[PDB]
Each structure stands twice: as C-alpha cells, then as structure tokens.
Amino acid sequence: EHYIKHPLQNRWALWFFKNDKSKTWQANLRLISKFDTVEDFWALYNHIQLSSNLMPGCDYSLFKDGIEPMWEDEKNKRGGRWLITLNKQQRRSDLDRFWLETLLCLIGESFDDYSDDVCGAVVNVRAKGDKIAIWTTECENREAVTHIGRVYKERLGLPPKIVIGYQSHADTATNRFVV
Amino acid sequence: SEVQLVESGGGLVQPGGSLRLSSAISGFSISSTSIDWVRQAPGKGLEWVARISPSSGSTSYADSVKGRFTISADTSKNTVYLQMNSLRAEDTAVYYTGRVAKDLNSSSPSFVVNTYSSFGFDYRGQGTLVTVSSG
Numbered sequence: 001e002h003y004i005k006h007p008l009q010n011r012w013a014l015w016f017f018k019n020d021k022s023k024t025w026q027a028n029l030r031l032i033s034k035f036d037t038v039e040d041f042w043a044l045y046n047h048i049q050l051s052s053n054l055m056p057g058c059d060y061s062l063f064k065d066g067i068e069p070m071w072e073d074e075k076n077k078r079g080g081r082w083l084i085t086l087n088k089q090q091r092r093s094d095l096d097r098f099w100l101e102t103l104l105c106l107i108g109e110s111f112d113d114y115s116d117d118v119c120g121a122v123v124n125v126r127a128k129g130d131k132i133a134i135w136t137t138e139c140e141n142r143e144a145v146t147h148i149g150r151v152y153k154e155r156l157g158l159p160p161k162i163v164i165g166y167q168s169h170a171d172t173a174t175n176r177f178v179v
Numbered sequence: 180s181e182v183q184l185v186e187s188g189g190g191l192v193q194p195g196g197s198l199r200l201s202s203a204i205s206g207f208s209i210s211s212t213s214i215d216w217v218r219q220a221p222g223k224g225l226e227w228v229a230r231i232s233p234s235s236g237s238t239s240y241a242d243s244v245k246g247r248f249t250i251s252a253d254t255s256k257n258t259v260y261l262q263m264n265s266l267r268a269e270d271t272a273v274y275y276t277g278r279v280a281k282d283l284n285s286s287s288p289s290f291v292v293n294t295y296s297s298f299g300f301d302y303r304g305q306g307t308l309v310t311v312s313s314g
C-alpha cells in the first residue's frame with residue numbers, strides 16, 4: 001500500500017515436487033509461487049518448510065519466470081547443471097545454508113553477465129543423499145559455465161578438494177566440466 | 180499494521196555539522212530483531228553504517244563512523260535513530276534502515292552487506308538523503 005518493494009532484476013517462480021509413485025514425474029510437479037521483489041522472496045522463503053524438513057523424495061525448484069524446471073523446456077534442453085552431492089550428515093549441517101546461498105546467487109545475479117545463462121536451481125531431498133544444482137541454458141557455453149561453477153563454489157565456501165561436476169541434461173536423461 | 184520503515188532527518192549541512200536521523204518502523208517489533216543503518220553514495224557499493232539490537236541495547240559501527248555516529252532506539256515508539264556528529268563530504272549518501280533476513284542473522288552485518296548487499300534485507304526503507312558540502 002505505502003511500502004515500496006525492491007524489484008529483482010528477473011521474475012521468478014518456485015516449484016514443489018511431491019513423490020507420488022502412481023503419478024507421472026510431470027504430474028508431481030506444481031508451481032507454488034511467483035515473485036519479483038526482495039521482500040516477496042523472503043516472505044515466500046519464511047512461509048514454506050526448509051528443504052531439510054521436506055518428506056523424502058520431494059524437490060524445490062526456483063526458475064526464471066517462463067522456464068519450467070524440466071529438461072524438455074526450450075531453455076534447458078541444450079543445457080546442464082552444476083551438481084552439489086550431500087551425504088546424510090550434511091542434511092542437518094549444510095543443506096539449508098547451501099540452498100539459501102544458491103537462491104541468493106540466483107535472485108542476486110551473482111555471476112554478473114554470466115547470470116543470463118542461469119535458468120534456475122533444484123534441491124532434491126533424498127534418503128541416498130541430498131542434491132543441490134544450478135541449471136544453465138547451454139552446456140557448450142564453457143566461458144559462462146566455468147565462471148558460474150568457480151563463483152558458486154566460492155560462495156558456498158566448499159573446500160578446494162570437494163570437486164563439483166557439470167553434467168548436460170542430455171547425458172543425465174541417458175561431467176563436461178569440474179571445479 | 181502494514182510494514183513501513185520511514186527514515187527522515189536528512190538535509191544539506193557543511194563539513195563539521197551534525198544531523199539526527201529517525202526511522203519510524205511499523206508492522207514488526209524492533210524488540211524482536213536487529214536493525215541496520217546502511218548508506219548508498221553515488222559510484223560506491225552499499226555501505227553498512229551501524230547495527231542495534233533494541234532488546235539488549237547491543238550496538239556496532241563501521242570503522243568509517245565509530246566515535247562520530249551513535250545508533251539508538253525507542254522500543255515503545257518502535258523507532259531507531261542515528262546521531263551523526265562532525266559530518267564530512269564522504270558521509271554524503273542516502274541513509275536507510277534495513278532488517279536483515281532472520282536466516283542470515285548469524286552473519287556479521289559487514290559480511291551481509293559485502294555478500295548480499297540489498298538482497299540480505301527482508302525489509303528496507305526508501306531512506307533519507309544526507310548531503311555534506313561547502314562548495
């Protein structure tokens with residue numbers, strides 16, 4: 001009404017995936033909220049369960065407005081992901097901190113001009129090990145992909161010896177880079 | 180009430196002058212959070228100025244203002260203040276109050292502003308312009 005919000009550079013949508021074995025993967029995927037301001041990002045993040053508190057087999061996906069969080073999207077089909085794989089102990093210590101850091105790298109456009117290659121990020125909550133990934137639009141764009149990977153690893157504070165991998169969605173559905 | 184942060188008290192002063200800034204906050208309690216003064220000058224990054232936790236009265240300051248600036252609070256009026264003594268040209272900026280997001284409140288305000296700048300505040304006012312000039 002009176003309060004003036006702070007526009008984000010991009011418009012965003014948060015998706016939720018509920019594991020129901022009877023349904024298709026696409027049917028289990030739901031858009032839960034759209035936002036495009038700093039205030040609306042924090043209001044959403046404060047009004048949903050932390051990744052660490054999700055039921056096993058569930059996902060959150062944050063994608064630029066108009067990009068669906070699936071391989072088949074025009075903006076994802078030629079692309080790939082920087083993948084962080086967590087062990088079972090890291091669910092309590094690192095999952096939420098790493099996911100929030102990933103969300104802030106996205107809405108804060110933290111890869112400068114290379115942020116234009118970012119489509120979104122996905123957290124997979126899994127018994128066998130949690131996964132966080134930043135999805136980029138073109139697995140051939142080695143300049144953008146290598147920069148995003150280096151800065152992402154810096155922002156997460158991962159030790160040098162924890163090597164993270166970039167996989168194309170084409171390869172997942174059937175590492176192109178590491179840092 | 181709707182959340183508002185209304186900063187006021189800015190103006191034009193000559194070097195050595197003083198101003199007292201106010202931020203009248205509505206819709207959340209300053210007794211349940213820290214509040215930061217931050218400032219934005221042309222051609223510069225967002226700069227953290229000072230933090231107060233009104234519940235405890237705990238305060239901290241940027242090296243650039245320590246001894247000249249005093250952050251304070253009136254919990255009953257849900258208002259925070261910045262007393263700015265012996266202002267210099269380099270203090271010219273828009274001054275804002277922000278609430279850092281609860282999920283980032285374990286980080287130092289210097290870390291939050293350096294890493295997340297504006298993105299680390301779940302609310303921030305439109306601020307008050309402070310201009311220190313003799314020429």
Ligand SMILES: C[n+]1cn([C@@H]2O[C@H](COP(=O)(O)OP(=O)(O)OP(=O)(O)O)[C@@H](O)[C@H]2O)c2cc(N)[nH]c(=O)c21
Pocket residue numbers: 025069070071072124126
């Ligand atoms: C990201 N994703 C997942 N899936 C389906 O879901 C399956 C599991 O993928 P995902 O949830 O990312 O990973 P999991 O840790 O559950 O399993 P894993 O294969 O990595 O061991 C995958 O093999 C596909 O059948 C998809 C099916 C699509 N048509 N498009 C997707 O983008 C897509």
